[PDB]
Every structure is written in structure tokens, then in C-alpha cells.
Amino acid sequence: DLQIGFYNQSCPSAESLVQQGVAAAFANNSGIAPGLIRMHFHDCFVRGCDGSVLLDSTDTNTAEKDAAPNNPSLRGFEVIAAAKSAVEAACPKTVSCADILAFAARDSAALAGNITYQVPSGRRDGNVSLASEALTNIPAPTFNATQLINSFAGKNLTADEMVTLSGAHSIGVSHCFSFLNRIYNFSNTSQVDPTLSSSYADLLRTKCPSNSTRFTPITVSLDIITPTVLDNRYYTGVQLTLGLLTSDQALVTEANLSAAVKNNADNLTAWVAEFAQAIVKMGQIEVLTGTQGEIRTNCSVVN
Amino acid sequence: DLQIGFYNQSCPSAESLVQQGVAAAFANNSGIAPGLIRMHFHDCFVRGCDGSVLLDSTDTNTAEKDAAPNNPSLRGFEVIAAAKSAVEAACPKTVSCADILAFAARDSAALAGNITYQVPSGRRDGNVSLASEALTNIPAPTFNATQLINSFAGKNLTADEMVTLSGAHSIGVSHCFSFLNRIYNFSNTSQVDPTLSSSYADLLRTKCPSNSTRFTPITVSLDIITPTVLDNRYYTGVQLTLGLLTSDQALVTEANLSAAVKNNADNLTAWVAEFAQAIVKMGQIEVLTGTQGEIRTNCSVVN
Ligand code: HEM
Ligand code: HEM
Ligand SMILES: *[C@@H]1O[C@H](CO)[C@@H](O)[C@H](O[C@H]2O[C@H](CO)[C@@H](O[C@@H]3O[C@H](CO)[C@@H](O)[C@H](O)[C@@H]3O)[C@H](O)[C@H]2NC(C)=O)[C@H]1NC(C)=O
Ligand SMILES: *[C@@H]1O[C@H](CO)[C@@H](O[C@@H]2O[C@H](CO)[C@@H](O)[C@H](O)[C@H]2NC(C)=O)[C@H](O[C@@H]2O[C@@H](C)[C@@H](O)[C@@H](O)[C@@H]2O)[C@H]1NC(C)=O
Ligand SMILES: *[C@@H]1O[C@H](CO)[C@@H](O[C@@H]2O[C@H](CO)[C@@H](O)[C@H](O)[C@H]2NC(C)=O)[C@H](O[C@@H]2O[C@@H](C)[C@@H](O)[C@@H](O)[C@@H]2O)[C@H]1NC(C)=O
Ligand SMILES: *[C@@H]1O[C@H](CO)[C@@H](O)[C@H](O)[C@H]1NC(C)=O
Ligand SMILES: *[C@@H]1O[C@H](CO)[C@@H](O)[C@H](O)[C@H]1NC(C)=O
Ligand SMILES: *[C@@H]1O[C@H](CO)[C@@H](O)[C@H](O)[C@H]1NC(C)=O
Ligand SMILES: *[C@@H]1O[C@H](CO)[C@@H](O)[C@H](O)[C@H]1NC(C)=O
Ligand SMILES: OC[C@H]1O[C@H](O)[C@@H](O)[C@@H](O)[C@@H]1O
Ligand SMILES: [Ca+2]
Ligand SMILES: [Ca+2]
Ligand SMILES: [Ca+2]
Ligand SMILES: [Ca+2]
């Protein structure tokens, strides 16, 4: 029971106002687009798309955003706040943080790849955000193909949709830490992952030191082919040994996944059409509707 | 007047002995294969395939190999000397340095790409080697499409063959200097060549400092996709903005050349078959035969 244009009557201007927020942000720093698409994904995989990822930590507990996979990597919170400030001045206590985040990811898909779709709305905001659930529910870049498939099945998403959605890594960046397993001490037999181009590896070793931590502020684009265009080049790059994350390279290590990649790589419009579906589908995981939850007036804190 | 099996009678073991020389060196350092293929190329473009590139400078004159595009980049000379020592112990004053280098490049194509072809022989060695002619006759990596086409025309090679032969950059390395134009001070409008991947550029900037010179001993593989396999991946990488040299990227800036790339990239046997013909053809530019020139007993020096 989520609908496109939930706010038709209650807040007609909302989708526009969010898109302006995002568009302003994007022109300053185009990295907010990939940032916000990841945020939406990280929302949806813990307690559903309920805005829980946006809550700050307190003295009471460490929230999701301060878990290892989220801090310091997640980015886009200013944008969300600014969209949310706009919307609250226009339709107070009406539009949820959950919908704003779903909307913003959609606006980022448009800005980064000209990918245009519509967003069912009527989500409500949760009151719970636990780092411990973030750790549990967010897949790691060290996952093999089977493990990726099982996260996503865990969220009622097909393998094929897992592959489709991985194409988000067609834009945005990675901290050194996230792929360090592949370029230092990979095995007893070699220092570097054989499934990663030895030239690329050499370059990544020179950019990213062995003592790198998750706070080391050194990043590298996930898609070496078209770093800022949300397109199907990710899938080409994965087939060419140019996949950056272990979880990226995982997609050609299993037959049905490997074929989905070939098709995504072979066909842009086809992947685009698929991506818009998967992400609309992702945006509907264990959502709160009706009277459930609240309309959080400040995204960073429970009312 | 060149024939396959020139030495059938005079030195039947020669082709084998050279292949052994090369094979031994290759197993110690696989970089000698690309090294030798470039050497053959650099021989053939100045005064013909006459062994001229192998001559040392004297107190009299600076030779080809001490010109900027050859020094310090050219490598493979010890290998050639070792094959030459072998062959002279076996068939004194019989096998030319020109043929040994043609042979060696062929042995390197086999080792690096399983590319097997036969080499017509009967070349003789020249007695002249000028740095000034090296500078004149060797194309620079800053060449646009037109300029590349005109070098090769100048040596009676078709544009299509130029494209085929560029495929040699599917293995081997480049010193930073050779592509430094692209990652520092490219224009007034931008620091980096926009036809080169922005992520790649950032990584090359990090490996290769701006103060770099042609003596700076820092190299980067020409083919980021399969750095040590002599295959058609060069051509893919060129189309994906991953072409390393300006002269590499040049090949998709002109419709005719750009279609030759698509073909090479789309079809491997096709490319392989063509490369073997082009290179045999390259090895017959302004060769000396019969009694012309000499059979140089020591490759580094005139008799
Ligand atoms: C399939 C399992 C996934 C894993 C294991 C994973 C993991 C990661 C990691 C480690 C990064 C880099 C973080 C860093 O070190 O800085 C990243 C980036 C990203 N991921 Fe994923 N990811 C996955 C799937 C997805 C999905 C489904 C989406 C969206 C639908 C997505 C969107 C993004 C985006 C947009 C970025 C770039 C972040 C930025 O540039 O700010 N990812 N991912
Ligand atoms: C088309 C015009 C060409 C230009 C401008 C050019 C230029 C270059 C440059 C600058 C390098 C790197 C040198 C350095 O800085 O270290 C290089 C490497 C190489 N080139 Fe070319 N090249 C061309 C054509 C060819 C042809 C026709 C062949 C073979 C038939 C060839 C084979 C090679 C090989 C094998 C290497 C690797 C060298 C090594 O690893 O030791 N190139 N080329
Ligand atoms: C031919 O004439 C050249 C100039 O007049 C002269 O430089 C040549 O030197 C060559 O001879 C030396 C030994 O005299 C060889 O040294 C060898 O080096 C390798 C490793 O680098 C060893 O495997 C080997 O055991 C030996 O010590 C050179 O390789 C060689 N150099 C070149 C470029 O040919 C002279 N040639 C001869 C055979 O006398
Ligand atoms: C909010 O207003 C929209 C029009 O301004 C509605 O969308 C339109 O719905 C028509 C039939 O419902 C359809 O023919 C139009 O093509 C569509 N327009 C667009 C731009 O999508 C919208 O209705 C919702 O969306 C459609 C796709 C269906 O799912 C409807 O059942 C939904 O109600 C209006 N939303 C609401 C909640 O009233
Ligand atoms: C890969 O390149 C080959 C060139 O070496 C193509 O084969 C050649 O195709 C010619 C038609 O243009 C034909 O006259 C030649 O006989 C043939 N040569 C050889 C050695 O096969 C090959 O083309 C495909 O295979 C041939 C036999 C025909 O069936 C074509 O219609 C095919 O396209 C190229 N392969 C592909 C998939 O393009
Ligand atoms: C790509 O697949 C789509 C499926 O939507 C199809 O309609 C389109 O014609 C395809 N294009 C090519 C060139 O295969
Ligand atoms: C919104 O919430 C956070 C508490 O996490 C607070 O620091 C921030 O300043 C608040 N903004 C406003 C305008 O109240
Ligand atoms: C050498 O022998 C081969 C095969 O036995 C032959 O085909 C080739 O043409 C011969 N070359 C010469 C110069 O006789
Ligand atoms: C080669 O040069 C020598 C002197 O170095 C000269 O006497 C001879 O005529 C030249 N021969 C050829 C074929 O160039
Ligand atoms: O092994 C090093 C060796 O290299 C070349 O072969 C020559 O310049 C020799 O004089 C030198 O001794
Ligand atoms: Ca959530
Ligand atoms: Ca991309
Ligand atoms: Ca020559
Ligand atoms: Ca290659």
C-alpha cells in the first residue's frame, strides 16, 4: 500500500522541493548523487526504508551511521536536511524522512545517469537505529557470489536484481580500506588478487598504503571506465578484470550472475529499465505505512 | 629478395638457437618480449631492418639508441647479444644481426601471445646509425591520427596496418614521460586530457610526479586490461578511454581508424592473422640483401 503521488493533496510541491535541494547540492559536489543512492540502499537493508540510517548517535547508543561500513563513508546528510527543511516550511509534519530519501536517490539517478522513474510514497519514519544491526545487515565487499545472493534473498530480492542493483557502483567512490584485501597480503601464494588487473593493482598500491584504515581519506572511483556516469560500464569493467571490489568481481564467478552481467554490459536501455525497477522494488522493503511510525520533523533525531 | 629458411643450408640451427636465447631471457623477465618487438620496429623505421639500432655510440657520433625515444626506453640488447654469441659459435660470420632481431621479435610474439608466424630471412647489417635519423623517423606518442598515418605511409604501410601494429601496445610498458602531456598541464581549460579516464588520470598523477623526465624510472603498462598477454584488449581499452598514449587514443578520433579498432577489438583471430602479416611486412622495409652490407660479427659494433 505505497502510492505514487501520496502527497498529491497534502504536499503537492514536495518532490520538486527535494529535487531542487539535490540539484543545488549536486552542482557544488557531484559526489552527493552516489552518496544518496547508497544511503537509500543502506536505509532499506536495515529495518526497512524507514529513515533509520539518518538518526544521530546519542549517549544512549551508537546508531547505524556510526557503524564501520557507514562511518566515515556515508555522505549526503546535509542534502537530506536541506530538502527536509524546505519541505517542512512548506508542509509541516507531513512528508516523512523515509520518502525524502527515496525521492532524493531518484533525483540522483536522474542527475547522474538520466535515469528517470517514479517513486511510490507514504513511508513513515522509524524510531530505532542500531549500529549492531548495521553490521549484521549490510553486506561487506568481501562477500562471494553466494553470500551476496543470500543477503538479497534475505531482503526478498532476486539474484538478478542483486546484479542489477550492483550497477550503482557505476558511479561513486571507494575508500582504500574497502578493497585493501585485494592488493596487500591476498594469499600465501601472491600479494595481489589474480582476478584484478596487475597494472591496476600496481597503481592502487601506489595510491593506497598498506597501513590504510577505514578512516584513511583516500578514495578511488568504483568505475574506472565512466567514473561519474551511472551507466552499464560497471559491467564491462567487471568482465575485464577491472572490477574494484571483491563483491564486484564476484559477479563473474558464477554462471547465472555472469550471464546477467553480459546482458547488462551488452545493453544500456535494458539495464536502465531494469535498474529503475529494482530500485523502486528496493524502496519498498519492510516499510512503515498508515499510522505506523511518525513523521520525523528533524531527520537526525526522533521526535 | 627475402626467403623463409635462408639459413636452411648455411646455419640450420639458427632460428632454434635464437628462440632458446629469447626463451631463457623471457622466463627470467617477461619484459624482454615487448622490448624486442619494439626494437624490431625501431630498427625497421630507420634505414630499414638493417640492425642499425643495435650499434653503440662512439667518440665519433651519437647513435640511434642514444636518441631520446630510444634511451633509456629500449631494452633487449643483452638478449640479442646472447643469441648472437650462440649463433656465431655455431656458424661463424653467417647469420646477420638484422635477421636475429626479426627472429627474436617473432619468438617474443609466440611467448607473449601464442602468435606464431614464419620470418623471411636474408637481411644484411648496415654500417650507419645516427641519433638524428632516429629522432626524424620514429613517431612520437604525441602524434595525432593524421601524423601517425603519414609516418607509416612514409614507410609504405597502410593506415589499417598502422592500427594493427599499434596492437603491439597490448603488452609492454611506458615511462611516465611518454604520456605526461596527458595528466599535467594538458590545456588552459583542464589539467588532464578529457579523452582519458578521470579515475585513471588521478591514479597516473599519483604514480607519476610532474617533475618527471624521460630518465625517471617509473613505468606503467600500456594495456591495463591484460598487461602481459599480447591480445586484442589494447583495442577495447582504447575505446573505453583507457588508451594510455596520446597516439593510442588517436586511433578512435578518426572514423576509418575507429572502425579498424572495433574490428580488432570485436574479433581476435582476425586481429592475430593481420598482426602476423603486418609484422612480416614491417620486417621488409628497405632491407639489404645479396652482397649489400655485411654480416656483423658483434651486433654492437661495425666490423
Ligand atoms: C551488493 C552488495 C554491496 C556491497 C557489498 C557494497 C559495498 C560498497 C562499498 C564497500 C562501497 C565503498 C565504500 C567505501 O569504502 O568508501 C560502496 C559504494 C557504493 N555503493 Fe555499494 N555495495 C553493494 C551494493 C550496492 C547497492 C545495491 C547500491 C544501490 C542500489 C549501492 C550503492 C553504492 C553507491 C552509490 C556507492 C558509492 C558511495 C559514494 O560514492 O559516496 N551499492 N558499496
Ligand atoms: C604507432 C606509432 C607508435 C608510437 C608513437 C609508439 C610509441 C611508444 C612509446 C612512447 C612507448 C613507450 C616508451 C617509454 O616511454 O617507455 C612504446 C612502447 C612500445 N611500443 Fe610503440 N609506438 C608506436 C607503434 C608501435 C609499433 C608499430 C610496434 C610494434 C610493431 C610497437 C611496439 C611497442 C612495444 C612492444 C612497446 C613496449 C616496450 C617495452 O615494454 O619494452 N609500437 N611505444
Ligand atoms: C662486442 O663489442 C662490444 C663493443 O665493442 C662490447 O661491448 C661487447 O661486450 C660484450 O661482452 C661482455 C663480456 O666481454 C658480455 O658480458 C656478459 O654479460 C652478461 C650479463 O649482462 C653475462 O651473462 C655474461 O656471462 C657476460 O659477462 C656482454 O653481454 C657483451 N655486451 C653486449 C651488449 O653484447 C663485445 N662482445 C663480445 C662477445 O666480446
Ligand atoms: C497523483 O497524481 C497523479 C497525476 O497527477 C496520478 O498519476 C496518474 O495516474 C493516472 C491513473 O491513476 C495515469 O493514467 C497517469 O499516467 C498518472 N500520471 C503519472 C505522471 O504517473 C497519481 O496516481 C497514482 O499513480 C498511478 C501510476 C497509479 O498507481 C494510481 O493508482 C496512483 O494513484 C496520483 N496519486 C494519488 C495517490 O492520487
Ligand atoms: C572474424 O574475422 C575473420 C577474419 O579473419 C572473419 O572470417 C572471414 O570472413 C570473411 C567475410 O567477410 C570471409 O570472406 C573469409 O573467408 C573469412 N576468413 C576466415 C579465416 O574465416 C570472421 O567472419 C566470420 O566467419 C566467416 C567464415 C563468415 O561466416 C562470416 O560471415 C563471419 O562473420 C570474423 N568473425 C566474426 C564473428 O565476425
Ligand atoms: C536491448 O534490449 C531491449 C530490451 O528492452 C530491446 O528492446 C532493444 O532493441 C535492445 N537493443 C539492442 C541493440 O539489442
Ligand atoms: C536536528 O537534530 C540534531 C540532533 O541530532 C541537532 O544537532 C540539529 O542541530 C537539529 N537541527 C535543528 C534545526 O533543530
Ligand atoms: C627451407 O625449408 C622449408 C621447409 O622444408 C621450405 O619450405 C623453405 O622454402 C626453405 N627455404 C629455403 C630458402 O630453401
Ligand atoms: C660501409 O662503410 C664502410 C666504412 O664504414 C665503407 O667503406 C663501405 O663502402 C660501406 N658499405 C656500405 C654497403 O654502406
Ligand atoms: O654486464 C654489463 C656489460 O654490459 C655491456 O654488455 C657492455 O657495456 C659491457 O662492457 C658490460 O660489462
Ligand atoms: Ca532503515
Ligand atoms: Ca559509469
Ligand atoms: Ca635500422
Ligand atoms: Ca594485452
Q: Looking at residue B42, which CATH number applies to its domain?
A: 1.10.520.10
Per-residue CA distances from A270 to A164, A231, A273, B159 (Å): 10, 11, 5, 36
CA-based nearest residue to A225, from A235, A217, A215, A216: A235
> Do B239 and B146 have their domain in common?
yes
A172: left (phi over 0), alpha (psi -120 to 50) or beta: left
Q: Measure A194 CA to ligand 1 centroid, in angstroms.
A: 22
> Do A272 and A167 have their domain in common?
yes
> Do A33 and A72 have their domain in common?
yes
Residue B16's contacts (CB-CB under 8 Å, 6 or more residues apart) are none
Nearest CA in chain B to A174: B199
Burial of B257 (0-12, 13-18, 19+ CB in 10 A): buried
Q: Measure B104 CA to ligand 8 centroid, in angstroms.
A: 19
CA distance A86 to A80: 10
Burial of A132 (0-12, 13-18, 19+ CB in 10 A): exposed
> Do A177 and A195 have their domain in common?
yes
CA distance A222 to B126: 52
Residue B100's contacts (CB-CB under 8 Å, 6 or more residues apart) are B14, B18, B80, B83, B84, B87, B299
For residues A279 and A109, is the Cβ–Cβ distance under 8 A? yes
Burial of A200 (0-12, 13-18, 19+ CB in 10 A): buried
- Per-residue HEC secondary structure of chain B comes to CCEECHHHCCCCCHHHHHHHHHHHHHHHCCCHHHHHHHHHHHHHCCCCCCCHHHCCCCCCCCCHHHCCCCCCCCCCHHHHHHHHHHHHHHCCCCCCHHHHHHHHHHHHHHHHHCCCCCCEECCCECCCCCHHHHHHHCCCCCCCHHHHHHHHHHCCCCHHHHHHHHHHHHCCEEEHHHHHHHCCCCCCCCCCCCCCCHHHHHHHHHHCCCCCCCCCCCEEECCCCCCCCCCCHHHHHHHCCCCCCHHHHHHHCCHHHHHHHHHHHHCHHHHHHHHHHHHHHHCCCCCCCCCCCECCCECCECC
CATH code assigned at A163: 1.10.420.10
CA distance A176 to A214: 8
Q: Residue B50 is part of which domain span?
A: 1-138+283-303
What's phi and psi for A121, nearest 5 deg? -130, -175
Instruction: Please count the CA atoms within 13 angstroms of the CA of B63 that sit on its side-chain side.
Output: 20
The amino acid present at B137, given as its one-letter code, is N
> Do B45 and B123 have their domain in common?
yes
> Do B2 and B112 have their domain in common?
yes
Residue A273 alpha carbon, nearest atom of ligand 6: 5
For residues A183 and A208, is the Cβ–Cβ distance under 8 A? yes
Q: Is A76 in the pocket of ligand 1 (CB under 6 A)?
A: no
Judged by CB atoms closer than 8 Å, whether chains meet at A242 and B225 is answered as yes
The Cα diameter of chain A in Å comes to: 64
Q: Is B170 in the pocket of ligand 2 (CB under 6 A)?
A: no
> Do B132 and B148 have their domain in common?
no
CA-based nearest residue to B239, from A82, A237, A292: A237
CA distance B115 to B34: 13
Question: Distance from A207 to chain B by nearest Cα, in Å?
Answer: 6
- Contact list in A for residue B226 (CB cut-off 8 A) is 197, 241
Judged by CB atoms closer than 8 Å, whether chains meet at B233 and A241 is answered as no
For residues B176 and B216, is the Cβ–Cβ distance under 8 A? yes
> Do A13 and A92 have their domain in common?
yes
Residue A17's contacts (CB-CB under 8 Å, 6 or more residues apart) are A83, A86, A87, A90
Residue B121: strand pairing partners: B3
Report how many domains make up chain A: 2
A interface residues, B as partner, C-beta within 8 Å: 197-200, 202-204, 206-207, 220-221, 223-228, 233, 236, 240-242
Residue B189's contacts (CB-CB under 8 Å, 6 or more residues apart) are none
> Do A34 and A93 have their domain in common?
yes
List gaps in chain B by the residue before each (C–N > 2.5 Å): none
Question: Distance from B109 to chain A by nearest Cα, in Å?
Answer: 20
The amino acid present at A278, given as its one-letter code, is A
- Contact list in B for residue A206 (CB cut-off 8 A) is 203, 206-207
The amino acid present at B165, given as its one-letter code, is L
Active site residues of B: 42
CA-based nearest residue to A203, from A250, A234, A240, A244: A244
> Do A289 and A155 have their domain in common?
no
The amino acid present at A228, given as its one-letter code, is T
For residues A55 and A63, is the Cβ–Cβ distance under 8 A? yes
Give the best residue of A224, A234, A266 to mutate against chain B (max B CB count within 10 A). Answer: A224
> Do B271 and B150 have their domain in common?
yes
Which residue from A231, A269, A274 has its CB within 8 A of the most atoms of ligand 6, so it is best to mutate?
A269
Q: Is the dihedral of CA B168, B135, B211, B194 positive or negative?
A: negative
> Do A272 and A220 have their domain in common?
yes
The C-alpha angle with vertex A101 and arms to A95 and A105, in degrees rounded to 5, equals 135
Judged by CB atoms closer than 8 Å, whether chains meet at A206 and B206 is answered as yes
Burial B258-267 (b: 16+ CB within 10 A, else e): eebbebbbee
Q: How was this structure determined?
A: X-ray
CA-based nearest residue to A260, from A243, A238, A284, A285: A238
Q: Measure B288 CA to ligand 13 centroid, in angstroms.
A: 10
C-alpha cell at B33: 618480449
CA distance A284 to A4: 12
